Amino acid sequence: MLILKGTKTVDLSKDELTEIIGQFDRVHIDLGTGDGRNIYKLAINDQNTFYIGIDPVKENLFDISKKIIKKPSKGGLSNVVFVIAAAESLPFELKNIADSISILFPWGTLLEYVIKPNRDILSNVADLAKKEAHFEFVTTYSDSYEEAEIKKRGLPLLSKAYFLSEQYKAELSNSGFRIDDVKELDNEYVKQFNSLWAKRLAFGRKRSFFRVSGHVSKH
Amino acid sequence: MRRYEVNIVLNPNLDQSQLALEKEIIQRALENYGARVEKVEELGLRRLAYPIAKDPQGYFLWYQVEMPEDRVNDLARELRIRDNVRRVMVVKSQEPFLANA
Amino acid sequence: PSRKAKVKATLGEFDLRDYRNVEVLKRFLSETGKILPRRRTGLSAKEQRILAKTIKRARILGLLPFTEKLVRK
Amino acid sequence: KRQVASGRAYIHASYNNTIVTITDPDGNPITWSSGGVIGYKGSRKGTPYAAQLAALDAAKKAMAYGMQSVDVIVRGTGAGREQAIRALQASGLQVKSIVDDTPVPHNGCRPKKKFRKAS
Amino acid sequence: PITKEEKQKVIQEFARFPGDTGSTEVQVALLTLRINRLSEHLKVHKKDHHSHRGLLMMVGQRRRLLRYLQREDPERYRALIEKLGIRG
RNA sequence: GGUGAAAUGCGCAGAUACCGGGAGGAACGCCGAUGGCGAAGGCAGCCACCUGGUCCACCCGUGACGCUGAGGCGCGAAAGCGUGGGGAGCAAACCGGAUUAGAUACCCGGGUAGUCCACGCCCUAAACGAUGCGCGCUAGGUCUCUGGGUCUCCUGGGGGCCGAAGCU
Numbered sequence: 001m002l003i004l005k006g007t008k009t010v011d012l013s014k015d016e017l018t019e020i021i022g023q024f025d026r027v028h029i030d031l032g033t034g035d036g037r038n039i040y041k042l043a044i045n046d047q048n049t050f051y052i053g054i055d056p057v058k059e060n061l062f063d064i065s066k067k068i069i070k071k072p073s074k075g076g077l078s079n080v081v082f083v084i085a086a087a088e089s090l091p092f093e094l095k096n097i098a099d100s101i102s103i104l105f106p107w108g109t110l111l112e113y114v115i116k117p118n119r120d121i122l123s124n125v126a127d128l129a130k131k132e133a134h135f136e137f138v139t140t141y142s143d144s145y146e147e148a149e150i151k152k153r154g155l156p157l158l159s160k161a162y163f164l165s166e167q168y169k170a171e172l173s174n175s176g177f178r179i180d181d182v183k184e185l186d187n188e189y190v191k192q193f194n195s196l197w198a199k200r201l202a203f204g205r206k207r208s209f210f211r212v213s214g215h216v217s218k219h
Numbered sequence: 220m221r222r223y224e225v226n227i228v229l230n231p232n233l234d235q236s237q238l239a240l241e242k243e244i245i246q247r248a249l250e251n252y253g254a255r256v257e258k259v260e261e262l263g264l265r266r267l268a269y270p271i272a273k274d275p276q277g278y279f280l281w282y283q284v285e286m287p288e289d290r291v292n293d294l295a296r297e298l299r300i301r302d303n304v305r306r307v308m309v310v311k312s313q314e315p316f317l318a319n320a
Numbered sequence: 321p322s323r324k325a326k327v328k329a330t331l332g333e334f335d336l337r338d339y340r341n342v343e344v345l346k347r348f349l350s351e352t353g354k355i356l357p358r359r360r361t362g363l364s365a366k367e368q369r370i371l372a373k374t375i376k377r378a379r380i381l382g383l384l385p386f387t388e389k390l391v392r393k
Numbered sequence: 394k395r396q397v398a399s400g401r402a403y404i405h406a407s408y409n410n411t412i413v414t415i416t417d418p419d420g421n422p423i424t425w426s427s428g429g430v431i432g433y434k435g436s437r438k439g440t441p442y443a444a445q446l447a448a449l450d451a452a453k454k455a456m457a458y459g460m461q462s463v464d465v466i467v468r469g470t471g472a473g474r475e476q477a478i479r480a481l482q483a484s485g486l487q488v489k490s491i492v493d494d495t496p497v498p499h500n501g502c503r504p505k506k507k508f509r510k511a512s
Numbered sequence: 513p514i515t516k517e518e519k520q521k522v523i524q525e526f527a528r529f530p531g532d533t534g535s536t537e538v539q540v541a542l543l544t545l546r547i548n549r550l551s552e553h554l555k556v557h558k559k560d561h562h563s564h565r566g567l568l569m570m571v572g573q574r575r576r577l578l579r580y581l582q583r584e585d586p587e588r589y590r591a592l593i594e595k596l597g598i599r600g
Numbered sequence: 601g602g603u604g605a606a607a608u609g610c611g612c613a614g615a616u617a618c619c620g621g622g623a624g625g626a627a628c629g630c631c632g633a634u635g636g637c638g639a640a641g642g643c644a645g646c647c648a649c650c651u652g653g654u655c656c657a658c659c660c661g662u663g664a665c666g667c668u669g670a671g672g673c674g675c676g677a678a679a680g681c682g683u684g685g686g687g688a689g690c691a692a693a694c695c696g697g698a699u700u701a702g703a704u705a706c707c708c709g710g711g712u713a714g715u716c717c718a719c720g721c722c723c724u725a726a727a728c729g730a731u732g733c734g735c736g737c738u739a740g741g742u743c744u745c746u747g748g749g750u751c752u753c754c755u756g757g758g759g760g761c762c763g764a765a766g767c768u
């Protein structure tokens with residue numbers, strides 16, 4: 001397992017991890033974390049949860065990685081770690097560990113895995129979580145102008161109606177996610193989200209956003 | 220050695236004795252540091268421009284000495300130790316720069 | 321205008337270096353402990369520069385003021 | 394209710410308000426007034442008129458303790474400081490002297506931004 | 513500081529002949545004297561960089577006069593060094 | 601108190617204004633300049649010690665010992681970093697008040713790092729005269745700082761202004 005220390009990458013064992021998380025009541029995993037800001041803001045407001053951010057592209061996390069290692073008085077934190085990985089090869093050490101997990105605005109291969117969905121990969125995503133952990137996914141094309149993309153990776157158009165369908169629900173069920181809720185959100189709402197892209201998308205043109213949430217049932 | 224000018228302002232409320240005692244320690248101190256007393260003046264009491272140690276007056280002592288510069292700083296540390304001593308200014312003697320003449 | 325009288329002219333031959341002549345030094349002070357400008361001290365760049373040190377030395381010793389209150393207003 | 398007669402009057406002008414404090418021959422206040430003490434609440438508090446009213450209020454009230462003669466001491470500059478020094482002279486009290494004793498550092502504390510941009 | 517005494521003592525102690533005030537030997541001597549005092553002052557006051565430049569220069573002007581000595585009289589040179597005790 | 605007006609804020613556990621006493625930190629009014637010093641960065645309370653550079657007069661001593669200087673070494677505003685100390689005022693971030701269509705700003709009330717000291721590190725800048733160093737030669741005028749002189753001006757070093765020839 002790879003974690004980020006400043007701008008340098010270092011190895012982290014399961015035993016070390018267990019010792020770290022032993023000091024916390026909860027573990028939250030943000031998958032495809034991007035720039036790290038969800039985890040940073042969330043972390044500054046909840047010192048009782050341990051935050052893990054996973055992204056395959058390490059340079060993106062540098063600003064926040066450098067920040068968290070500063071002294072506490074200058075913004076340093078002791079409840080955040082960044083994991084370097086892709087959905088297709090998640091560290092075994094993170095199996096069955098998370099009390100809650102989010103994927104916000106995925107793109108490329110990760111987006112394809114959430115929306116088709118790819119059963120094996122999402123199953124592996126569910127594997128990071130303990131039985132009945134909470135999850136939320138927030139996605140938005142809304143389509144048309146962004147396509148291009150529909151022509152490329154195929155993809156959903158994708159209405160709340162699509163996320164409500166028996167087929168998507170059943171596929172999710174096969175992967176271990178029980179849809180509890182589906183919401184359509186507007187630009188104004190998304191500004192709550194504190195993240196690269198949530199901000200960029202939000203202040204940009206009108207778009208439909210969808211938030212799908214629920215619990216991990218596979219276990 | 221270098222020629223200096225010691226200034227000392229002490230409490231204006233000392234009695235004939237108390238005063239002469241402080242001067243004792245001074246003269247005593249001077250030798251202890253090499254102060255070769257070239258001369259002295261004693262304007263004594265004077266109405267200060269502003270109060271010093273709440274007291275609006277002061278007693279003055281002026282000594283022009285000659286001594287090892289390497290100790291002039293100590294000489295004054297010593298001179299300031301006294302409680303009745305409320306000012307001590309040592310100055311390198313200087314040719315009197317005249318003016319309007 | 322500042323053409324009342326140069327403090328220098330209105331006075332004798334003094335030792336600008338003497339820091340105890342409260343009598344004369346006091347002459348170069350404003351209606352406050354402030355040191356007068358050459359415009360009024362009639363001294364020169366060099367003379368005036370020596371005065372300052374003297375007037376300051378005299379202040380520490382307590383002979384000359386640092387600042388006085390203004391009357392009238 | 395002591396009967397002083399001779400005393401001091403401190404006029405503290407400022408660009409936001411004026412406040413006069415009357416005192417005995419050695420500093421302890423007898424009575425005090427300001428732009429707020431009387432009507433005025435915000436901006437009005439500063440204005441020379443207020444300064445005037447406050448000056449008067451200060452004297453009148455001090456007339457009670459039997460004040461008569463006073464030495465005025467002006468501190469600061471501001472919205473009508475002279476009016477205060479006038480309302481006194483007229484108030485009834487014989488003003489023995491007016492004196493500016495506004496404090497000024499010999500450069501000590503960095504002032505707040507609002508008062509910097511200088512040197 | 514270096515008294516006139518302290519000074520002339522060195523000047524006469526190095527002069528090539530009665531009244532010699534500016535022989536390379538002398539100059540070098542006087543500079544070696546100033547240097548040492550400065551090098552001294554500076555063993556303490558490691559912060560007084562301003563004075564240190566002054567030293568860089570003294571040392572400079574000296575090593576440059578000496579350079580001139582070899583070139584000319586290689587004997588007086590070895591002579592001056594040994595005496596003053598320069599190098600190290 | 602504060603503002604365009606305000607509000608937050610502080611105050612009857614008595615604030616503000618006033619007098620006296622004490623503690624602590626930081627800066628050093630007037631003089632002060634159109635001024636001075638330094639290679640630059642930069643440097644202004646006073647005192648002593650230690651110490652660098654620099655000008656002038658006499659022309660007394662050496663006798664080309666000179667100039668520049670890749671690399672090196674050293675110095676190098678602020679912010680920033682490490683350890684420890686200090687912390688009055690100020691104040692990124694931050695917490696509030698107001699203004700606004702919104703105010704992540706300007707204005708107002710708070711406020712942490714920092715700003716201070718030591719030791720070490722960083723090495724940047726509109727680090728500017730936006731003008732590399734040395735030397736010689738080419739009208740003057742005017743003000744100025746500092747030294748010498750036969751001292752209503754001449755002569756040497758420095759700081760400004762105007763301008764010959766010329767340059768652009």
Ligand SMILES: Nc1ncnc2c1ncn2[C@@H]1O[C@H](C[C@@H](N)CC[C@H](N)C(=O)O)[C@@H](O)[C@H]1O
Binds near residue numbers: 057109
């Ligand atoms: N196959 C993948 N597995 C894991 N993460 C991926 C994969 N593909 C893309 N990502 C990440 O998904 C993120 C999508 C970005 N828009 C950032 C999303 C981030 N969660 C945010 O809300 O700001 C990027 O940081 C990609 O690096």
Ligand SMILES: [Mg+2]
Binds near residue numbers: 612
């Ligand atoms: Mg009551």
Ligand SMILES: [Mg+2]
């Ligand atoms: Mg007090």
Ligand SMILES: [Mg+2]
Binds near residue numbers: 624
């Ligand atoms: Mg304290």
Ligand SMILES: [Mg+2]
């Ligand atoms: Mg220069």
Ligand SMILES: [Mg+2]
């Ligand atoms: Mg500068």
Ligand SMILES: [Mg+2]
């Ligand atoms: Mg000759």
Ligand SMILES: [Mg+2]
């Ligand atoms: Mg010859």
Ligand SMILES: [Mg+2]
Binds near residue numbers: 669
């Ligand atoms: Mg060179």
Ligand SMILES: [Mg+2]
């Ligand atoms: Mg600094």
Ligand SMILES: [Mg+2]
């Ligand atoms: Mg520090």
Ligand SMILES: [Mg+2]
């Ligand atoms: Mg500290």
Ligand SMILES: [Mg+2]
């Ligand atoms: Mg503020």
Ligand SMILES: [Mg+2]
């Ligand atoms: Mg340092």
Ligand SMILES: [Mg+2]
Binds near residue numbers: 676723
């Ligand atoms: Mg630096």
Ligand SMILES: [Mg+2]
């Ligand atoms: Mg002359």
